[PDB]
Amino acid sequence: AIELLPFHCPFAAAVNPRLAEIEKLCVDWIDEFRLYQDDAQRERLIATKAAEVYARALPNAAPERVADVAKWLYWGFATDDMVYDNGPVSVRAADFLPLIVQLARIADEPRSRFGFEIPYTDALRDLTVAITAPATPGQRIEWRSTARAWFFGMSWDVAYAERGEIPSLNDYLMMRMHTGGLASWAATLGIADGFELSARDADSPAVRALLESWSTFALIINDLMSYAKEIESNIITVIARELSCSPQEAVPHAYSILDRISGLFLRLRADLLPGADQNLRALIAGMEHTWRAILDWGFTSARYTRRDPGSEPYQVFPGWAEQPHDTSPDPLPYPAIAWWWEQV
Ligand SMILES: CC(C)=CCC/C(C)=C/CC/C(C)=C/CC/C(C)=C/CC/C(C)=C/CSP(=O)(O)OP(=O)(O)O
């Protein structure tokens, strides 16, 4: 295990007023499709509180829509602990790829069926239709492509897992945004909150840098809190290999990269907001709420704090920082993502 440092976030906490209602609609959905093998698994899935992190990211969205997108994450966690990050398929790329393309296919078209399907695939069809059916054509095109990118990203993790190797810090920062599916998270934010970027904004290299920098630092925050659970491919382990230091010595380096990427995100945000349309301002607002959502929910969620729902927490929130850890405005030397700083 390791000791985490306090976190810097300059945005106020936000939660959807009708959170209690959103979670019940999700619990009803979980029980309807039986997203568990016994009551213990049901308890553990509910303890993730996936409804919360979405409600904290979507404080002004209709609760029916927050609940619909929350199912994606509930299903996510259920299939994550079963298939993606544990089990025999999680360490064989030739077994993972045939399985994972079927889930990517069902995301694109729920009417696509196969002879053998993994548990909770019926739930994947339902949440897909529930999320995408009322959405715009553009939002659906975004849902499909971002989902495939996530499933393709998780395959890349299994490759390194199969070989028992840790990827380079350059390769990790490039691919981590895909493995965490933050592009898909942003797409569900648009669908639920009822915003959609223009083709112009989405393609523009400033907004791409904004999304990728945001995506990366959001998932580095995940790595820090989820490090303990994953032991009981992480920014701590990747830095530990590359610098040949211990996990504890890789903490300040992680926070340095975290602060340098979030520092760039705020710079890009400040440049875009003045000229931003109602759709881009809504995403930026969504990105702000997500920052607080991950920290406020993450260190109160049993997933990253408890070994079982009911046991005392092994992790507590490390606290709030007034200043950033690293104020260096220079670009990171990792050439897969160094181009971000060119859009300032
Ligand atoms: C709340 C946010 C945006 C980030 C915090 C970390 C989160 C939960 C990111 C997910 C945001 C979503 C819903 C992207 C949509 C595609 C789906 C359904 C991913 C489900 C698998 C998953 C949880 C990928 C996250 S990376 P990892 O496996 O290391 O997560 P943990 O083991 O620590 O839980």
Ligand SMILES: [Mg+2]
């Ligand atoms: Mg995982």
Ligand SMILES: [Mg+2]
């Ligand atoms: Mg993973």
Ligand SMILES: [Mg+2]
């Ligand atoms: Mg994690």
Ligand code: NA
């Ligand atoms: Na049991």
